[PDB]
Design a protein around this ligand. Structure first.
Ligand SMILES: [Mg+2]
Lengths: 131, 56, 294, 110
DNA sequence: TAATAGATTAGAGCCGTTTA
């Protein structure tokens, strides 16, 4: 017979100095620490992949409910949680049309062309891989 | 009676109406726009009529 | 198999955050098994799914979703290629910021299976972490916390304690998973709640980083939890504080918006950056920040 | 001061919410303040038609898209309507009182 | 060099989404 001690769960901080244990609820309640003004999303993929990413990014604005809302908290919507704009109509899209090497190289050189040559700024590139 | 009214299509034509309204207040003229001054949680049509025939 | 890691490695030299999303992930309704439900059934998790992606995006766009003094958490992991040692680091700022940068520039041990760090390489890694702490918090750390998925030899530990400066205590911890102690619960139908730990010895113990959670009213891990065996094999420290630190390290998973992962985040992040680094050719002074690998 | 009514396809015709809404209309007539009842339209399926008889008259707030845009509409309307030092610590200490009461690590031996 | 073990350790894949 041996004792099982309990360690008090650490509190991950959030906005306004408020702390909580679940990152989801803490984000959906108080929000993240530093406020970026928006996410200049970049996309690399086929046109169908662009349609999929745009539809999903539109859905992110709306709230999506888990099948067990008390076990895993639902999503309020991106602007509701983070307070930064990530709309789907202001995306920097780059269309594409040893096999691993050249498959990687297509995205590599297109992304480098976009980051280096293109004028539009991108905060993060969302490579939408095919299937 | 001292006010300027702007009527427009609500879903489609917002950018021009908003721009014109804001320029008008910038010049000093009073404006009433259904997408700027029509307050939430009011009788929108009743207030529209009151503004049309009371201060316009 | 090696598309994602090689792509990130080839993006490393020009620092640009990137998130890789599968087409079957974002719109998962379309891709069916041709005989019924979709290949990837995400209905029960969709909203939570829309959580993690968003958080990941918000992390790679330069945002800090959630944070957690005088302690440097330096979790190192070996990668089989010759072997490469690569580490992840975290500190606490004077302005209460929790710097969670990496420790990159992998140190190559030529032995095929010796998951141990050579004396010179150990000195270089520890001094790199020390200079990172000095440039971050303007002063040397009061304590450095080294932890890994492996036990540590002797001569290397001489290297760590010889490269370290004065007023600096170092503790070495080993975290191992799937140690066959599958502790159930007698009363209910739900496993032992997360946060409970069995102290096997003053330097070794078990921790349940995953299991039933009261707030979620469910289990982080299905079936029965697999506790992590935490062994303070080298260095001196008290088991309760190290256990607290490990449970805190199980919170900083920015790769996902999940309650907590079953292993410390520091090792998993170091492992991912190591996989990306050894996926492709050697690059000098890699980005070292996890928005480029994770 | 204000009476916000959620306008989902289930929350616009239920007996209890209708009772609260009707009493809200009568008290609105009592204070003769037109800026009392505010419908928050949050249901995509429920159009601006088919909405309740009392609340069809009223200017709703568009929560159907971008819940944060609706929330910002709420704050700007409340400031415009002069609705009465914010401290999020109150909500921080209140969230786990009600929402997490069956869900906590209580002191019991097992 | 081969083998038989324990002890560590590392890689890969694979299904389910955590009992209300
Ligand atoms: Mg991820």
């Amino acid at each position: 017979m041996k004792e099982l001690i309990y360690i008090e769960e650490p509190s991950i901080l959030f906005a306004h100095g408020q702390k909580c244990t679940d990152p989801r609820d803490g984000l959906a309640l108080f929000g993240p620490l530093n406020q970026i003004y928006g996410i200049k999303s970049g996309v690399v993929g086929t046109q169908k992949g662009l349609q999929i990413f745009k539809s999903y990014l539109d859905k992110i604005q709306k709230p999506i409910y888990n099948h067990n809302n008390i076990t895993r908290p639902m999503f309020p919507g991106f602007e509701a949680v983070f307070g930064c704009k990530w709309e789907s109509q202001n995306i920097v899209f780059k269309e594409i049309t040893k096999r691993t090497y050249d498959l990687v190289t297509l995205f590599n050189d297109k992304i480098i062309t976009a980051n280096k040559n293109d004028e539009e700024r991108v905060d993060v590139w969302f490579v939408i891989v095919p299937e | 009676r001292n006010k300027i009214f702007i009527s427009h299509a609500t879903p489609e034509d917002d950018d021009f109406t908003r721009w014109l309204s804001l320029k008008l207040i910038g010049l000093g003229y009073e404006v009433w726009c259904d997408i700027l001054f029509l307050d939430k949680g009011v009788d929108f049509w009743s207030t529209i009529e009151k503004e049309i025939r009371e201060n316009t | 198999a090696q598309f994602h890691d090689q792509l990130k490695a080839r993006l490393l030299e020009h620092t640009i955050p990137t998130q890789i999303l599968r087409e079957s992930t974002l719109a998962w309704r379309d891709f069916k098994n041709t005989f019924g439900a979709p290949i990837r059934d995400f209905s029960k998790i969709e909203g939570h799914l829309a959580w993690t992606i968003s958080t990941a995006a918000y992390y790679k766009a330069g945002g800090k979703p959630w944070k957690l003094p005088g302690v440097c958490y330096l979790g190192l992991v070996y990668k089989k290629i010759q072997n490469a040692c690569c580490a992840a680091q975290m500190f606490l700022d004077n302005g209460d910021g929790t710097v969670f940068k990496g420790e990159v520039g992998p140190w190559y041990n030529p032995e095929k299976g010796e998951y141990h760090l050579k004396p010179k390489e150990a000195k270089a890694l520890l001094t790199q972490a020390l200079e990172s702490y000095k440039e971050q918090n303007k002063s040397y750390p009061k304590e450095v916390f080294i932890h890994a998925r492996t036990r540590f030899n002797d001569e290397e530990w001489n290297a760590f304690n010889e490269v370290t400066p004065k007023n600096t205590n170092l503790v070495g911890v080993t975290i191992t998973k799937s140690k066959p102690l599958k502790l159930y619960k007698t009363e209910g139908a739900f496993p032992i709640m997360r946060g409970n730990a069995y102290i096997v010895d003053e330097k070794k113990a078990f921790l349940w980083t995953l299991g039933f959670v009261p707030k979620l009213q469910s289990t982080l891990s299905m079936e029965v939890p697999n506790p992590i065996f935490i062994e303070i094999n080298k260095g001196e420290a008290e088991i309760q504080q190290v256990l607290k630190d490990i449970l805190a390290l199980t919170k900083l998973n920015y790769n996902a918006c999940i309650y907590a992962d079953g292993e410390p985040v520091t090792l998993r992040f170091a492992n991912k950056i190591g996989e990306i680094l050894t996926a492709s050719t050697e690059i000098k002074t890699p980005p070292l920040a996890f928005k480029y690998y994770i | 001061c204000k009476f916000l009514i959620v306008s989902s396809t289930a929350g616009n015709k239920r007996e209890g919410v209708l009772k609260e809404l009707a009493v809200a209309t009568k008290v609105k007539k009592h204070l003769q303040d037109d800026m009392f009842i505010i419908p928050l339209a949050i249901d995509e399926n429920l159009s601006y038609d088919d909405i309740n008889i009392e609340i069809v008259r009223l200017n709703a707030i568009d929560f159907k898209k971008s819940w944060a845009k609706g929330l910002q509409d709420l704050l700007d309307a409340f400031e415009k309507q002069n609705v009465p030092p914010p401290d999020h610590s109150k909500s921080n200490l209140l969230y786990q009182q009600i929402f997490l009461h069956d869900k906590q690590a209580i002191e019991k031996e097992e």
